[PDB]
Amino acid sequence: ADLVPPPGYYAAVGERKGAGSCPAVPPPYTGSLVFTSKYEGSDSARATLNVKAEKTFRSQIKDITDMERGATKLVTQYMRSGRDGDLACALNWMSAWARAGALQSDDFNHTGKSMRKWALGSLSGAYMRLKFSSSRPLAAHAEQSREIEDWFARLGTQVVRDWSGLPLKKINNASYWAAWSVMSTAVVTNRRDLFDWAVSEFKVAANQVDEQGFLPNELKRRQRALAYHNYALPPLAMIAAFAQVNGVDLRQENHGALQRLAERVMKGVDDEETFEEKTGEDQDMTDLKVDNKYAWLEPYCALYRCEPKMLEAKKDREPFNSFRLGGEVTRVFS
Questions:
Q1: Cα–Cα dist 95/44, whole Å
Q2: Which residues hold substrate?
Q3: How many CA atoms does the CB half-sphere of 223 hold within 13 Å?
Q4: Nearest Cα to 141, choosing from 71, 82, 84?
Q5: CA 328/CA 136 separation, integer angstroms
Q6: N- to C-terminal Cα distance for the chain?
Q7: Cα gap 284→179, rounded to integer Å
Q8: Which ranges constitute the DSSP H helices of the chain?
Q9: Which residues of 282-300 are buried (b: 16+ CB within 10 A; e: fewer)?
Q10: Gap between the Cα atoms of 120 and 122, Å rounded
Q11: Across-strand partners of 321?
Q12: For residue 330, what are the CA distances in angstroms to 125, 129, 302?
């Protein structure tokens, strides 16, 4: 059977009254993907922010950032209000990068291949709505659609190469996000090999969740441990939600590991104690205060019967927008 997204991705294009213009496409990024890490100089915990290095990093990736944020924004605006100019603009941006063969460099380091997988997830995740909307907005744009989908397929194959062949100690949230990008790409391109890789990566993650709901590789990030556990949830929950409607039920993998992880995270958010006791360090709660970092609640509560605690957590923070997940996460799960 052809691969499909969750049913919410088939929603008609909206007609909400809102009209921004079409900005120039960010220059397609065809350079080397060898970037400075924001954690440059850290010990093995890789949890010490280097402000100067981060500034350098953000500058290096600026065109990629602008592409990710801008193109998802255009798709979101189109799905909300249905102005053809926004569709045309979004497709012009994505097809420009596709034709240029952006982000395809074989010259990369960890930070660089992470930019490749992140941008792939953002763009394909947004494009998913265009592709499967009952309005069929791509019907009039066959050439561009083909160009864009072929580019996604090239990048997806490369992302599998980028994160394959690793031992567990080197498989962390970075791989989970890569698996989301590859799952998203798999459904856009109807590529079962990509689908299968993302599923296998989820299963690795599920088996990394220990008997208490902790991930050893995320615990290693010391004061950022809780933040990184929360950061693991969105791609894992998205992968499971996508796999489910394609006939692969991952909810019970390793004794319901995804639920065990989610419940442990939410315990830590209520009270940091157990993560501190587990890591021996006070947790940086900064990221746990950011509403959109709980976007994982949308696919999660589509998968599991959420108890009132989870439901209220979702209700209080809705709607969720997360460009790395394709934009409007609440809308595609309602």
A1: 40
A2: 37-38, 110-111, 228
A3: 8
A4: 84
A5: 18
A6: 24
A7: 27
A8: 51-60, 62-81, 84-100, 110-132, 142-163, 173-189, 192-208, 216-219, 225-245, 253-270, 273-279, 297-303, 308-317, 329-332
A9: ebbeeebeeeebbbbbbbb
A10: 6
A11: 328
A12: 13, 13, 11
Task: Give CA–CA dist 147/269, Å, rounded.
Answer: 43
Position 35, amino acid: F
Tokens of 122: 């953002």
152 and 127 Cβ atoms separated by less than 8 Å: yes
Write the CA distances from 203 to 151, 219, 239, 275, integer angstroms. 27, 19, 10, 24
110 annotated as ligand-binding: yes
**What amino acid is encoded at 115 in this protein?**
M
Give residue limits of the domains in the chain: 1-334
Resolution of the solved structure (Å) = 1.6
- Ligand-binding annotation for 228, yes or no, is yes
CB atoms within 10 A of CB 16: 9
Q: What angle do CA 287, 289, 294 make, to 5 degrees?
A: 80
- Bridge partners of 108, per DSSP, are 33
Beta-carbon contacts of residue 60 (< 8 Å; ≥ 6 apart): 35, 36
44 three-class SS: coil
Assess contact for 294 and 236: CB atoms under 8 A. no
Q: How many CB atoms lie within 10 A of CB 161?
A: 11
37 assigned binding-site residue: yes
Domain 1-334: top CATH class: mainly alpha
Q: Angle at which helices 253-270 and 192-208 pack, to 10 degrees?
A: 60
Strands 327-328 and 321-322: antiparallel
Cis peptide before 319 (omega within 30 of 0): yes
The length of the chain, given as a count of residues: 334
Determination technique used? X-ray
Q: Please enumerate in sequence order all residues whose Cβ is within 8 A of that of 121, keeping only pairs 6 or more positions apart, or say none.
A: 177, 180, 181, 184, 235, 324, 325, 326
Residue in 182, 161, 37, 76 with CA at minimum distance from that of residue 119: 182
Residue type, 173: N
CB atoms within 10 A of CB 170: 12
